[PDB]
């Protein structure tokens, strides 16, 4: 029977930058979630709402597997009710999260000698993000009262910084790929179960 394709989601050459975080919708299939939970590939597999120990028995309306590269320092911000540059201006999980958040170390692939500049996060945004929202915007940051006219200088900044990932870094500033399985169940027929 159709197996929900997590090989893409998990073993893919490139991950999106946390600011433009990526989201594939997994629907109509069976997937073993204990192919994941067993692995201990993962430095973090914290779960919120549900439980991993026997998870491939429940059925769900919708499964969203979001994925992106953050850094080790910030992994702890992809929790419910977190705050920081990521939970505020980049990727926000709700109060009522019901899913699991998986991450592993990523130097081997994403670090680079001379810094990897391809992964970007947001520095600046007017207000915070509503859960699961996603500003892909690159308009100049009005830090104060003066307008900008697409010219950046004092109090007009560019809103994205690069993570500048380097392989001999501290664990803290080392790449971490992150998959955020959000299992939500609605008032419609279910279409992911497992065994």
């Amino acid at each position, epitope marked *: 029977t159709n197996l929900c394709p997590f090989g893409e989601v998990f073993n893919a050459t490139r991950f999106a930058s946390v600011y433009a975080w990526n989201r594939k919708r997994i629907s109509n299939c069976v997937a073993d979630y204990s192919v994941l939970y067993n692995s201990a590939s993962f430095s973090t597999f914290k779960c919120y709402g549900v439980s991993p120990t026997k998870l491939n028995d429940l059925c769900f309306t919708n499964v969203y597997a979001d994925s992106f590269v953050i850094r080790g320092d910030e992994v702890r911000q992809i929790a419910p009710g977190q705050t920081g540059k990521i939970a505020d201006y980049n990727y926000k999980l709700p109060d009522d999260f019901t899913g699991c958040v998986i991450a592993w170390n990523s130097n081997n692939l994403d670090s680079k000698v001379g810094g990897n500049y391809n992964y970007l996060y947001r520095l600046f945004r007017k207000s915070n993000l509503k859960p699961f929202e996603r500003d892909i915007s690159t308009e100049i940051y009005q830090a*104060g*009262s003066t307008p900008c*006219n697409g010219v950046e200088g*004092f*109090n007009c*900044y560019f809103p994205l910084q690069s993570y500048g990932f380097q392989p001999t870094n501290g664990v803290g500033y080392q790449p971490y790929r992150v998959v955020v399985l959000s299992f939500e169940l609605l008032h419609a027929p279910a279409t992911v179960c497992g065994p």
Partner: antibody
Amino acid sequence: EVQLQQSGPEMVKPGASVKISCKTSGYTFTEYTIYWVKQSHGKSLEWLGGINPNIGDTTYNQKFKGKATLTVDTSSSTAYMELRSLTSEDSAVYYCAREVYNYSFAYWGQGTLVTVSA
Amino acid sequence: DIVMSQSPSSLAVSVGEKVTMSCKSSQSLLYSSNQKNYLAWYQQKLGQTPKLLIYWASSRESGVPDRFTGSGSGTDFTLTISSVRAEDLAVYYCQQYYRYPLTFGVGTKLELKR
């Protein structure tokens, strides 16, 4: 309660140097921008520059640049202004004022008096 | 550089009545993105640090009485006190902020006729 606090008025031998403080308090120093305004007695107001404490960068009024230098301290929460060569035009009252996204000067500090006397 | 043009240097009329001073500007203070005009009005009573009356050309700030109202766009803005009071004695600067450097107007003084 937003409060900005300058220093005691000062008297400087001409051509020498001075530094005026500004203790901000009651809001996050890094967030909001500090401007400085010179109002010399019997005249109007004059903008002289800005500083953004977070990233530390400054903009300057053309006609004051070089002869003044804005310079914040993160820890103490304190804005600064230094006038390097004090002629007599510099005899004035310099203001330090904070900002809001809506308008340029929302909270004003006491005022320091600068008299440049030999 | 963006130099502010007020009129008139001195003004003075009796309680009640209607003062109406003006501010004009080198450059359209119009930002075509948001459609706001980048011009504020401060109320420096003497011996006091200035106090903002109108922001974005046309909006009483919180606590400011409705007898004050700004108006205008582009070049010709206008501060209007309907029915001046005794307390409304002060110099009234217009100030722009659609570009740096931030410029102030020359000042409109309100003396009071008794």
